[PDB]
Design an enzyme around this catalytic site. Structure first.
Site, PDB file in Angstrom:
ATOM      1  N   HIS A  28       0.754  -1.087  -0.012  1.00 39.14           N
ATOM      2  CA  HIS A  28       0.186   0.143  -0.083  1.00 39.14           C
ATOM      3  C   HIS A  28       0.701   1.308   0.078  1.00 39.14           C
ATOM      4  O   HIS A  28       0.250   2.458  -0.454  1.00 39.14           O
ATOM      5  CB  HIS A  28      -0.711   0.121   1.051  1.00 39.14           C
ATOM      6  CG  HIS A  28      -1.886  -1.187   1.142  1.00 39.14           C
ATOM      7  ND1 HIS A  28      -3.447  -1.160   1.060  1.00 39.14           N
ATOM      8  CD2 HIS A  28      -1.859  -2.476   1.468  1.00 39.14           C
ATOM      9  CE1 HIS A  28      -3.953  -2.296   1.073  1.00 39.14           C
ATOM     10  NE2 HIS A  28      -2.869  -2.933   1.183  1.00 39.14           N
ATOM     11  N   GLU A  49       5.620  -1.605  13.789  1.00 39.74           N
ATOM     12  CA  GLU A  49       5.345  -0.542  13.662  1.00 39.74           C
ATOM     13  C   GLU A  49       5.293   0.314  14.521  1.00 39.74           C
ATOM     14  O   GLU A  49       5.308   1.719  14.567  1.00 39.74           O
ATOM     15  CB  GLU A  49       3.995  -0.463  12.641  1.00 39.74           C
ATOM     16  CG  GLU A  49       3.931  -0.768  11.281  1.00 39.74           C
ATOM     17  CD  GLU A  49       3.816  -2.016  11.135  1.00 39.74           C
ATOM     18  OE1 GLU A  49       3.841  -2.957  12.194  1.00 39.74           O
ATOM     19  OE2 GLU A  49       3.706  -2.722   9.940  1.00 39.74           O
ATOM     20  N   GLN A 112      -6.878  -5.212   4.275  1.00 41.31           N
ATOM     21  CA  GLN A 112      -6.424  -3.973   5.376  1.00 41.31           C
ATOM     22  C   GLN A 112      -7.145  -2.916   5.122  1.00 41.31           C
ATOM     23  O   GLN A 112      -6.804  -1.858   5.905  1.00 41.31           O
ATOM     24  CB  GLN A 112      -5.118  -3.731   4.760  1.00 41.31           C
ATOM     25  CG  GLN A 112      -3.943  -4.922   5.183  1.00 41.31           C
ATOM     26  CD  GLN A 112      -2.261  -4.840   4.590  1.00 41.31           C
ATOM     27  OE1 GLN A 112      -2.324  -5.148   3.354  1.00 41.31           O
ATOM     28  NE2 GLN A 112      -1.920  -4.001   5.111  1.00 41.31           N
ATOM     29  N   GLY A 418       2.519   6.802  30.125  1.00 40.02           N
ATOM     30  CA  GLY A 418       3.296   5.871  30.717  1.00 40.02           C
ATOM     31  C   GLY A 418       3.402   4.254  30.259  1.00 40.02           C
ATOM     32  O   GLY A 418       3.112   3.490  31.165  1.00 40.02           O
TER      33      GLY A 418
HETATM   34  C1  LIG Z   1       2.461  -0.937  27.990  1.00 39.29           C
HETATM   35  C2  LIG Z   1       2.285  -1.124  29.517  1.00 39.29           C
HETATM   36  N1  LIG Z   1       1.939  -2.125  30.240  1.00 39.29           N
HETATM   37  C3  LIG Z   1       1.766  -2.464  31.404  1.00 39.29           C
HETATM   38  C4  LIG Z   1       1.964  -1.343  32.327  1.00 39.29           C
HETATM   39  C5  LIG Z   1       1.896  -1.473  33.853  1.00 39.29           C
HETATM   40  N2  LIG Z   1       3.167  -1.438  34.485  1.00 39.29           N
HETATM   41  C6  LIG Z   1       3.617  -0.276  35.156  1.00 39.29           C
HETATM   42  S1  LIG Z   1       4.988  -0.652  35.996  1.00 39.29           S
HETATM   43  C7  LIG Z   1       4.908  -1.931  35.127  1.00 39.29           C
HETATM   44  C8  LIG Z   1       6.142  -2.948  35.535  1.00 39.29           C
HETATM   45  C9  LIG Z   1       7.659  -2.518  34.850  1.00 39.29           C
HETATM   46  O1  LIG Z   1       8.577  -3.284  35.057  1.00 39.29           O
HETATM   47  P1  LIG Z   1       9.756  -3.419  34.236  1.00 39.29           P
HETATM   48  O2  LIG Z   1       9.633  -3.262  32.670  1.00 39.29           O
HETATM   49  O3  LIG Z   1      10.773  -4.714  34.264  1.00 39.29           O
HETATM   50  O4  LIG Z   1      10.869  -2.368  35.025  1.00 39.29           O
HETATM   51  P2  LIG Z   1      11.297  -2.257  36.698  1.00 39.29           P
HETATM   52  O5  LIG Z   1       9.997  -1.718  37.222  1.00 39.29           O
HETATM   53  O6  LIG Z   1      11.356  -3.645  36.992  1.00 39.29           O
HETATM   54  O7  LIG Z   1      12.547  -1.514  36.913  1.00 39.29           O
HETATM   55  C10 LIG Z   1       3.748  -2.437  34.573  1.00 39.29           C
HETATM   56  C11 LIG Z   1       3.824  -3.643  33.853  1.00 39.29           C
HETATM   57  C12 LIG Z   1       2.196   0.045  31.752  1.00 39.29           C
HETATM   58  N3  LIG Z   1       2.517   0.912  32.312  1.00 39.29           N
HETATM   59  N4  LIG Z   1       2.527   0.138  30.336  1.00 39.29           N
END
Ligand SMILES: Cc1ncc(C[n+]2csc(CCOP(=O)(O)OP(=O)(O)O)c2C)c(N)n1
Ligand SMILES: Cc1ncc(C[n+]2csc(CCOP(=O)(O)OP(=O)(O)O)c2C)c(N)n1
Ligand SMILES: Cc1ncc(C[n+]2csc(CCOP(=O)(O)OP(=O)(O)O)c2C)c(N)n1
Ligand SMILES: [Mg+2]
Ligand SMILES: [Mg+2]
Ligand SMILES: [Mg+2]
Lengths: 554, 554, 554
Positions: A28, A49, A112, A418
């Site tokens: 596309h 992506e 698509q 976040g």
């Molecule tokens: C895309 C996404 N999935 C889930 C969450 C929820 N979440 C917040 S903190 C967290 C833990 C992150 O752990 P890690 O990447 O291993 O870093 P660490 O805290 O262990 O240092 C999650 C899954 C989020 N914020 N964004």
């Protein structure tokens, strides 16, 4: 004489000054791939992506310029949604070029086609629109670009039907316009500028707080002239942080997060001058522990919705942060007789120095390598020649703790969205930008977060991008695991244990150098070796899980 | 003690400085109605929610302030959709408060619950939002106002769940914020201002075109100053016309349509300063017929999308029009080296007046009253104390051919929506805010258009509103019938003839003064009469249907 | 050989077997007016698009078929929104054809072009789509009609760009599909049907209730056969009522609303067969006020979300309500041993009658005409040959009490949107449908509600539609004045005074029969007259405002 719609897209982007695209191939959108091929415009093709989108963001954030993501119809678009929403909340300028089903054979249950991508992008873009004619391309591309670059910065979705892209039109017939948009932003009215300047002159404890819109315009040199004449301490949220990197060492307050314990030392700020920094996650919400309820606030933001949205403010200006900084440096130039501010700078410096030394004292690395120490190892390598990309929850708020006392060339952490795992794409794109400016990028992510786009070690190798991915590996989804204990109960940890996998093994397979370290000296040396070569590198850092970062206790 | 949810709305509304409301009663929003009763806030209840909405537009357009619409749940919201859409395209500041299904009994097939009013308004509002908690009422109302008022101006929907409007919370327990917004708009960076003025002094046939944003800021005093020092002629779209009434007749080009005839005199503009005037319907799109292709355009608009959307421009500034005028008038007090600008004003004046006499030369009244002759009976009656609302297509095209040389206090005509029937609501709400000053309001509408909101004489009578309705009667949907003849053929007319009712009787049945007219003097007696009195006046006017306006041609 | 897109629209409409369109002319849709005029297909041009929209519903509702509404771009569409929203909730099949901005010249700020009409209609249509190619018209028009006609019936918006309509194609190359869609709805599984009949046979006090979907398939003889063999009392909501008009009167239970008392008469139904009746405003909401908890319920609905939405039920069948009644009729036609419910029916008939007379005994008209008396006058002019359209809240809550136990040809009213003023458009379109049916249409509306579309008297006279417009006039917004007394205070009424305008004068001023009456003598004479006169007529009726209609007890 006959050229495709895809050619017009590229020609307009050429004119706009774009030199890089980030994307993933689709039939596309091949006309755009072909046109970029002809004009030597590198498309950094990825393995997802989402990584491509984040890369356009990273490029935009580390380069203070326009980012361009290139995705195909259907899944190509839906996969770019998280980067779109992330750019939206982070106020970052990205043009999202996307393919779609052809207008001919609309509503034919076809490959698509079938999803309203414009409707989907609508709630999370400055502008989302579908091109209805091939000749409309240059004007609409140029329109989309203007939307994204003007304050407040943000993502734009241009939807280009396969139809419209394959269409051949006489090149001599359609006009490709220039990017005619003033680089300088709108300034505040001289009356409010005279007022704000007056209000900050007669002030016992004044502070500047920079936001994202300060980095986009990146009017650093003017920020110097203004900060030198006034001698007022400057703080920033993560995104504004790098704007402090060129300030004379004395008036560098650091990250706004440590305007926090100003309460115990009388140090509750007198007057806060907010420049594009919003009320929310980054400035202690409306809970007023960072921006004190009893302080007079001067807020400058391109969108009036942000003007004292959570706390009652004093002066509410709506102009461009860049132009506003310029207007302040201009007025502050001849008005070169400003009050004695030696012993408020020392206080700000010393309180941030306090919180720092306080945490260093409570940080033991016996039996398990402390996240704080691994943060200090990276920190010793941070100057204006380095961009730092932060991902991974526990990872980044320990990282945040050392980040205030170094001067990063760039610092790209999570926004309000976040989304765990956005860091890899972001860092890849940032490394492309940093290559032009002769700089290095270092991603600092968690063991969990890296697995989002771990296939991007391939792209690093294929495109020879010298990114150093550092993984804070505490065998788990860190911050969330803490929430399961601290908020629920000691033995209620489910689905957060991630006790499998050699991440350096993964990087080694894609052809990138993998280091697994588990001590200060070994990690220190691994990082030193990584920097020493111009090659992509993974540094799997075995790190402690149990310790609690100060931000989490709030 | 305890105060209601709607009670909070009204309190937050008065601190904003608003003095009136336009609505229709809903038992969903009686919580507002009751709180309004005992603050002496007048709710001007119409006979159709559509009318109330347009009345909120009028009020905001006539007195250059914020308008407020207040509708009930479900059917109340949907009836206000046309007003909202009209406000969106016209760039007019209106706060649309709507009741909705209580959050309690959500998704239960309830009375007036079950439709997504926010989703419906989102494509046509700067902001659309539903209040989730009662304590949120103040900070979100004030937020909606901030959005509605900043550049570019536009409508905002705040959805207030009947639930939230009934819940009582402690009156002391939530702060009612002040409206803190700089009022003075942001202005261009001086470098651009220099670039502008340098090109402007270089120009041999310079021109200025004003759009809606000039009228929204209404800096007549700064504009006069600027127009004086430079001596550059000034033009405007229907919405920017009021802003020419306080300038020296020598530099008054009138409506932009007059710029059409200029190319036929090798006197096409050299350079054109568009202040909030958009490339589109009113400025001849990108045809180069009003704004020449050979002319060098400087465009100042709050929206970067607008900056050269249909035509390549020389300088593009994103800044507030009102702030820009301020700056242009200020930069003028230190220049004092401007060309005479007298022989170009001569050319501009000659061409305008020449076009005017050219229509008078063609217009006969020997068998039916020429719309243009009937239009003049209004022209020699128009000054800074009259507000003219135009509706009906053929009506307003003819009525404009005179409006350039007279100078009203208010001129409100169609925007891009082109919605026949908005005039009555707009006119009604214009009478309030003409009662605010001392100005008197005249509506000039077509015979078909008036049928839309004809039941509004009941309101005009009930609410003692002195509005004069001049029904331009051509016994048909005029311009559409002309379309059928000119575009397809003579005997191809369908659904465009309207040869039945007594409208001047219709108004009288509602208890308003109803008049008649055959020819020029017949109407003068009715006009000077109802104008001499101080009450609702409905005038009917039998008028020739045949003649084609110059605006129709092309 | 070369035909316009508008022609393609009309030929497709003809092949679908539509005979009438309701709309308001615009140049954007003239190609449709030209085609219609060529094929002798009447477009009922109104005075407001909402009236045209509502007329399309009224046509669809009164004639149990598809209604087609034709509106122009921009204002034309936005004015049709309330109809769209109403047809949405009332489950009524209406094709809304709208014009829009040309696809060439998209994003040109041009006339009537800049509103995302599909996005607006999206929340409130079964399907909303914009045609992209002229060749697509026939398949897309026919696709929309299928979407509207199938269970559950609803509105559809086909957006037709001016571009696409004006465009000319070789007529020979594009095919015009048939409407291939079965007239019979899907019936339940035999196991589901048997367990439904197994419950009905083995139950003591069972009851049937009908909904909107029962009038859409309008299966009288099948329902008639099912109720004959089973002998179960049958009720219905506002939209369903007209289906009872053909049953044995020993089964005619009237409006399910009568069903409140069964709670405190000890004979509450032990089984309820909900046939399209929805758990909402029509059926005591979720609370057991109309549908008791002690009752086991079998529910049939095309929408699975509705299946015991707010109550527990014994059996939930997704099937066509009309198709089910056929499966009910067919299978029950062998069962020659259905338990007698003569005793139960007698109880039911006498409770609805007990309710009726207890309302009748009081309500004395010794000073003013208790709206109950005004309603009973209308009643003795109601049979299979009369369609009663109803508007006004305080108005209809009296009429319902008399409608039960008299059989209308059609009984159209407010659904869940509850928008006042929809009744005029509705009756206007209904009358058109009733004219081919040979029936006569009477509109009974409130005094405030009538002001919404009061220009439609011009339509009634121009199109020669002998609709009788009864106005129950209490010089006020009735129910919303009521609420202000009963929920605030007796001295707390503002914005409900409508003590003005001889509504009968305005209607007479548009050239229709105008009558004002007050007493049963004056009234039933004005009525008897306006009937015998085959012409549009308005009967203004001065009525008491104070009396509470019984449907309000909590
Ligand atoms: C895309 C996404 N999935 C889930 C969450 C929820 N979440 C917040 S903190 C967290 C833990 C992150 O752990 P890690 O990447 O291993 O870093 P660490 O805290 O262990 O240092 C999650 C899954 C989020 N914020 N964004
Ligand atoms: C809401 C809306 N409906 C329909 C149209 C299409 N339309 C354009 S001009 C016109 C004629 C208006 O006639 P009238 O109000 O009598 O004024 P006249 O042209 O006769 O002077 C119509 C119906 C429109 N622009 N807006
Ligand atoms: C569009 C719209 N406006 C207002 C309301 C609120 N409302 C409910 S009942 C009512 C009274 C209308 O009744 P009226 O036409 O005056 O006749 P009455 O009930 O007095 O017999 C109103 C205005 C609504 N539901 N929808
Ligand atoms: Mg981790
Ligand atoms: Mg007319
Ligand atoms: Mg009434």
């Amino acid at each position: 004489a006959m050229i495709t719609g895809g050619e017009l897209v590229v020609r307009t982007l050429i004119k706009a000054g774009v030199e890089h695209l980030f994307g993933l191939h689709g039939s596309h959108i091949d006309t755009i791939f072909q046109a970029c091929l002809d004009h030597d415009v590198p498309i950094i093709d990825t393995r997802h992506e989402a990584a491509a989108g984040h890369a356009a963001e990273g490029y935009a954030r580390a380069g203070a310029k326009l980012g361009v993501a290139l995705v195909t119809a259907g899944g190509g678009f839906t996969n770019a949604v998280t980067p779109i929403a992330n750019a939206w909340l982070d106020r970052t300028p990205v043009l999202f070029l996307t393919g779609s089903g052809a207008l001919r054979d609309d509503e034919t249950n076809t490959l698509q086609a079938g999803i309203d991508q414009v409707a989907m992008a609508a709630p999370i873009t400055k502008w989302a629109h579908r091109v209805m004619a091939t000749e409309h391309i240059p004007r609409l591309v140029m329109q989309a670009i203007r939307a994204a670059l003007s304050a407040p910065r943000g993502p734009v979705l241009l939807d280009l039907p396969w139809d419209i892209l394959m269409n051949q039109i006489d090149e001599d017939s359609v006009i490709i316009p220039d990017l005619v948009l003033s680089a300088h932003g709108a300034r505040p009215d001289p009356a409010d500028l005279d007022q704000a300047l007056a209000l900050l002159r007669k002030a016992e404890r004044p502070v500047i707080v920079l936001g994202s819109e300060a980095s986009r315009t990146a009017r650093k040199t003017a920020l110097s002239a203004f900060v030198a004449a006034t001698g007022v301490p400057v703080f920033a949220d993560y995104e504004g942080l790098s704007m402090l990197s060129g300030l004379p060492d004395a008036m560098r307050g650091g990250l706004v997060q440590n305007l926090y314990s100003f309460a115990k030392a009388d140090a509750a700020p007198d007057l806060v001058l907010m420049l594009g920094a919003r009320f929310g996650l980054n400035t202690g919400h409306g809970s007023g522990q960072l921006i004190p309820h009893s302080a007079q606030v001067i807020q400058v933001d391109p969108d009036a919705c942000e003007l004292g949205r959570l706390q009652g403010i004093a002066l509410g200006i709506v102009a461009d942060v860049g132009g506003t900084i310029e207007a302040l440096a201009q007025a502050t130039a001849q008005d070169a007789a400003w009050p004695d501010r030696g012993d408020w700078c020392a206080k700000v410096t010393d309180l941030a120095q306090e919180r720092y030394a306080s945490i260093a004292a409570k940080s033991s690395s016996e039996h398990a390598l402390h996240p704080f120490h691994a943060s200090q190892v990276i920190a010793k390598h941070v100057d204006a020649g380095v961009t730092v990309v932060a991902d991974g929850a526990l990872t980044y708020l320990w990282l945040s703790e050392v980040m205030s006392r170094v001067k990063p060339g760039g610092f790209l952490c999570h926004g309000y969205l976040g989304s765990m795992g956005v860091g890899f794409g972001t860092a890849l794109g940032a490394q492309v930008a940093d290559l032009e400016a002769g700089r290095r990028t270092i991603l600092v992510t968690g063991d969990g977060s890296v697995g989002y786009s771990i296939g991007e070690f391939d792209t690093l190798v294929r495109k020879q991008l010298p990114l150093i991915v550092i993984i804070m590996n505490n065998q788990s989804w860190g911050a969330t695991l803490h929430f399961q204990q601290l908020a629920v109960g000691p033995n209620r940890v489910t689905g957060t244990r991630l006790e499998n996998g050699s991440y350096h093994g993964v990087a080694a397979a894609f052809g990138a150098d993998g280091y697994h370290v588990d001590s200060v000296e070994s990690f220190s040396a691994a990082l030193a070796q990584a920097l020493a070569h111009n090659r992509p590198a993974c540094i799997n850092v075995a790190v402690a899980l149990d310790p609690i970062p100060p931000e989490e206790l709030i």
